[PDB]
Amino acid sequence: ERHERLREKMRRRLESGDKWFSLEFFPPRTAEGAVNLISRFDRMAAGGPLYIDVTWHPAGDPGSDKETSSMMIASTAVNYCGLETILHMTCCRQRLEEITGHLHKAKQLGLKNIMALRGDPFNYAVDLVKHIRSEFGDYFDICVAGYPKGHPEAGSFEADLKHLKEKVSAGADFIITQLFFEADTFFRFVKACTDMGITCPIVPGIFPIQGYHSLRQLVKLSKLEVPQEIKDVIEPIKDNDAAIRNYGIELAVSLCQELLASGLVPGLHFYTLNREMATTEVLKRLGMWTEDPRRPLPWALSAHPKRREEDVRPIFWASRPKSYIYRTQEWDEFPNGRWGNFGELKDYYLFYLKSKSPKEELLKMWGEELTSEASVFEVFVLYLSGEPNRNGHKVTCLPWNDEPLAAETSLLKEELLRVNRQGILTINSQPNINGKPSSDPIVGWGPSGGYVFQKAYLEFFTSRETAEALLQVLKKYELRVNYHLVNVKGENITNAPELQPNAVTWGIFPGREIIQPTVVDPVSFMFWKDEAFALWIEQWGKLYEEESPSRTIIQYIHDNYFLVNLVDNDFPLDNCLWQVVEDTLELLNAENLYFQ
Amino acid sequence: RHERLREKMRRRLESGDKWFSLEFFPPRTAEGAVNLISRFDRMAAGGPLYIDVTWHPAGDPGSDKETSSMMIASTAVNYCGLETILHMTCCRQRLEEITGHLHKAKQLGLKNIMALRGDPFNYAVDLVKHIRSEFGDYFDICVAGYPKGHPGSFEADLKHLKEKVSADFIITQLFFEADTFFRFVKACTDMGITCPIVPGIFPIQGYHSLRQLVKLSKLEVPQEIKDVIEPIKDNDAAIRNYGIELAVSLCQELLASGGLHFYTLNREMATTEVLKRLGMWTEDPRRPLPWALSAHPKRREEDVRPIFWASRPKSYIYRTQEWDEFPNGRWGNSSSPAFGELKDYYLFYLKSKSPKEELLKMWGEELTSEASVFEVFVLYLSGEPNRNGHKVTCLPWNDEPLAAETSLLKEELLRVNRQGILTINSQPNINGKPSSDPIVGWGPSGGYVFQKAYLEFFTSRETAEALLQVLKKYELRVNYHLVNVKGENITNAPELQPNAVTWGIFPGREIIQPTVVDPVSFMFWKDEAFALWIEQWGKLYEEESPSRTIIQYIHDNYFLVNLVDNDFPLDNCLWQVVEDTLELLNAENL
Ligand SMILES: Cc1cc2nc3c(=O)[nH]c(=O)nc-3n(C[C@H](O)[C@H](O)[C@H](O)COP(=O)(O)OP(=O)(O)OC[C@H]3O[C@@H](n4cnc5c(N)ncnc54)[C@H](O)[C@@H]3O)c2cc1C
Ligand SMILES: Cc1cc2nc3c(=O)[nH]c(=O)nc-3n(C[C@H](O)[C@H](O)[C@H](O)COP(=O)(O)OP(=O)(O)OC[C@H]3O[C@@H](n4cnc5c(N)ncnc54)[C@H](O)[C@@H]3O)c2cc1C
Ligand SMILES: Nc1ncnc2c1ncn2[C@@H]1O[C@H](CSCC[C@H](N)C(=O)O)[C@@H](O)[C@H]1O
Ligand SMILES: Nc1ncnc2c1ncn2[C@@H]1O[C@H](CSCC[C@H](N)C(=O)O)[C@@H](O)[C@H]1O
């Protein structure tokens, strides 16, 4: 589409006449708050914001690597959520060495939009604008604050304008305003700027009333008075937050509609206070929320500036995209179009092998004690089925899979239960698909109006005895199935032709060239299996004492099982991988007449 | 298999393989230069291994004249995709001169040079020397051999021949006696040269052929064979039939009991009949892509092209020859350079195969209205003769016969061409047939091939206007591009990016999408597409004539247009697009 500077996107929708919206957020003070905020990021991205924001305050150690910092929240938005992101930054109580350090760190992590702020008790925001330009040149897009009714500390309202003028002239690209109550206020302010010679975009900020706290909040945020009109309607319902928010919505809709109708406003900046409901309904009533949102690819896109060309990945990190980005982040270029057109996969320190969950919860799910390998088989079975284990606990994750199953796995639940129950322990799979509509709600992706294709895939740990039987069976399948077996020692075998990669998901779209975003690559597989095997020990086996029978079992599996991936090349035909497994079970059991 | 001639030599014959060979002489006349390129294209059908062009300083072989040895062989590689050996001789020529010739050989893409003494500071020997110093290895230089031998005595000459192995192989003279050079085989193993031997073969095709055998071979045909040609009448056709039969038998035990290098003499018939008779002539192979791979080394990675030059492959090579790198994978991510212009429509290797007298009979020695022109398009597609008994072999745009896939939509094409939709390119839609399909297959076996339906055609300004209306209700399904000779165009191609219209899915591999429809490339193509009206058809007629006027009027006013149906799993809707356009051009009102 368009992978261009924010201010390039903005003047495009300008000329185009398309109105847009943005969302402002604040870094939470606890991890659980941080975790939930990122979930909201993902839910509200579906609306199509031009951009989102993360505020900045020095009481919150905002430049640090703490998970709750403005810097790490912004960085998550860009690198994991794929969003165009604006990092706010204030220069009250800061020296040159501090600010320059923060700017370098944001550049490394992929940020590329700064809002230059003074902050409240380097003396004025303009010093930060002029400084970003001299020290980083034009690398960053920069925006700056404006005040429709004048800044409080300013003497003349007229003088505040002249100041604004100078910081915009120092090197800013657009203005975001403080909240207001009457469209007419924005309008005069705009004509004051227009008459001053300020020529950049001025985005109005909108603050939705979302309950009773909103009144005290917006006066703290802005130092404006709340009008008796709003006050008189709200004080009768002072204790009914639900009813208040429908009035906030009516007010916001009416205001924005009077702004949008202006034509002198290109977009809308919402102060969300990290809450979803009210802001989404205001935008939907306006017609600015995306009607039929599509996932762009089967995996989520990064917004890092270096990584704009990537549109194909190996399938092996599908449940661990954070590990993939980490192991590839030193690369100079990324594959575009075909994988096989090659920098090495980087190695890893342990914090990526650790689980999120505490030890006591994992033990309740995976088992305080194991009595044999079959104890392990049932944990995978229960991960797939959803039923409770014999102590009453659902299995919500595996060392390889910390989220729930995608929708596509419902196409093959019973087949998967069958093989896990016989000791083929799966960690990745996908059904075959023969050109379903690209808008399909279970497997669709990419532009509307085209056709999506998948070859059936299966990946799994199994004992040496089973693998050895699998290889004999694979001879009848030599031309149809591609196969790769490897153990923790690195003994491996594969019929990948000249060790080339195999496309397994792809899409044909009207008016465009082909997109093949997922492949099975034998070279990548040999780096992936180093993690896959290590996760047995780092998340499961260490839950037990070194001399325990439960550890002996997990360690045994790690030292002996094979990792296996299988692809059925004949996507127009029924998935043949289930019959491959049944043929293996027969071969293993060929001397027992009770299974024939 | 895309490797050098040394690797391309030892790898086949060890693993139960034997190969062809064909030697040609550079022609003397322009008309002969075009005849020879055509004969290059035909006999390339015979799945040969390597081809060969002779050399002699009297014919200024290093020059740029179309008759020069080095141009013929440069054309063989660049425009015909044959792997070729350029002969080179050292007879009396300065140290600098041979160097300049060697510079041009590899530079023009030539890889297999053959060093030979020239019959009037070096003699036979100093061939590999000159080259080797600036040659490299496994580039495959080859040296001459005369089995029954001729000037010296075999003590030094026969010593000098297997001594010059240092040179991947050698070529042997005509063997008049069956297995006469067979004594050369084991004796050549005794010579100690670790390279293989390549044997000759020379046919009889006329009376004045016989004498030609004495002049080039400097040997005497056996008395027995002369006892059968003297009775062979002045009917060179007679003498010929006995020639191929003399041949097929000789090497028959020879191919096994012992590659066959056959001295064509720039003639096809005999050397071919012996080929399929010897069991070494492939007449229907699988195609690796919908279009033919260039033999040049710099186009190693080329695997996607615009659909617009499908009938004019050699023009595409000509207009792309200045490019440093070639598009791989997708077209649009290769940031292509500009196409070079085609200003010379009379290049011997791009001209039409038909002389002007033939084109007049098939296209009309006079034209009376625009409909005169429609009918010629219709006859080309149908195969039926015109009113004067002549089938239409070709069009300005299409100098060969239809591909097999067009039979899937012959009747549909006849309907639109009759109505003034003058087509020059098409393909059917294909929803996943086996890659080994005989009509539309290509690529590795055991996969699936796909096509979006395509249509490209000239039509009048009035028809184009009405087509635009009809397309308003196909906007989501049909991609379109229209343009006239002046350059006014309209397309709904999104962001002007290209559209993939043929692709395949193969076991254990990544996707291959060799054909696109690209709105940028289409602006360069249209210049060539329109110029063919005047250069091929219009200039058949006197400049002031009513015929030329009609062609001139079409060139100056019609639009060229291409259409794609994106919904490959559904029946082709391009035929309904046209019916609706022709409906809208009629005055019902109820
Ligand atoms: C959209 C928006 C986002 C915000 N985000 C944050 C955030 O993330 N974190 C945070 O802590 N605060 C934030 N703020 C608060 C903002 O910092 C305060 O309003 C602050 O008091 C003023 O900062 P400023 O960048 O507007 O400063 P300035 O532009 O420097 O204005 C401050 C005052 O100085 C005066 N002045 C300007 N230039 C000169 C000059 N050359 N000489 C003399 N006087 C001058 C102006 O008239 C004005 O009265 C935000 C405000 C807005 C509107
Ligand atoms: C397949 C083939 C293709 C040909 N193509 C051409 C062509 O394109 N143009 C053309 O003009 N002719 C061509 N000829 C003919 C060739 O040029 C003549 O045979 C020429 O007179 C020398 O051939 P040669 O390459 O064997 O020479 P050389 O290899 O130089 O001569 C070897 C012969 O001469 C003797 N000899 C010569 N010098 C020495 C020496 N210093 N020490 C020892 N022995 C020596 C050897 O004993 C041996 O008999 C071709 C011949 C063949 C078989
Ligand atoms: N333990 C397990 N066994 C089998 N499949 C699993 C699994 N855990 C997760 N999966 C499945 O593995 C898939 C990873 S996404 C697979 C590739 C994707 N269809 C694409 O186009 O790239 C999801 O479908 C997920 O539900
Ligand atoms: N005058 C004409 N009108 C319509 N089609 C024509 C034509 N002359 C030639 N053709 C057809 O146009 C096609 C050019 S080859 C088409 C490309 C092919 N689909 C691919 O995958 O690359 C041939 O099929 C040929 O037979």
Descriptive report:
- Chain A: Its EC number is 1.5.1.53.
- Two copies of one chain form a homodimer.
- In chain A, helix 3 links the parallel strand 2 (51-54) and strand 3.
- Chain A is 39% helix and 16% strand.
- In chain A, helix 5 packs parallel to helix 6 (157-171) and helix 16 (464-474) packs across helix 19.
- The longest helix of chain A is centred in the middle third of the chain and has 20 residues, at 241-260.
- Chain A is of the alpha/beta class and 596 residues long.
- Chain A has a domain at 6-286: TIM Barrel (Alpha-Beta Barrel).
- The structure holds flavin-adenine dinucleotide (2 copies) and S-adenosyl-L-homocysteine (2 copies).
- One flavin-adenine dinucleotide binds at residues 55-57, 88, 90, 117-120, 124-126, 145, 151, 153-154, 160, 163, 167, 176, 178, 205 of chain A.
Give keywords.
binds S-adenosyl-L-homocysteine; 39% helix; 9-stranded parallel β-sheet; 5-stranded mixed β-sheet; homodimer; 596 residues
Please bin the fraction of helical residues of chain A.
25-40%
Oligomer: homodimer
Unique bound compounds? flavin-adenine dinucleotide, S-adenosyl-L-homocysteine
The first-level CATH class of the domain at 6-286 in chain A is given as Alpha Beta
Total E-strand runs of chain A:
19
Rg for CA atoms of chain A: 28 Å
Largest interface, with counts of residues having CB < 8 Å to the other chain, equals: A-B, 34 and 35 residues
| Largest beta sheet: strand ordering of chain A | 7-6-5-4-3-2-1-9-8
PDB class: oxidoreductase
Keywords: one carbon metabolism, rossmann fold, S-adenosyl-methionine, Structural Genomics, SGC
Assembly: dimeric
Entry title: Structure of human 5,10-methylenetetrahydrofolate reductase (MTHFR)
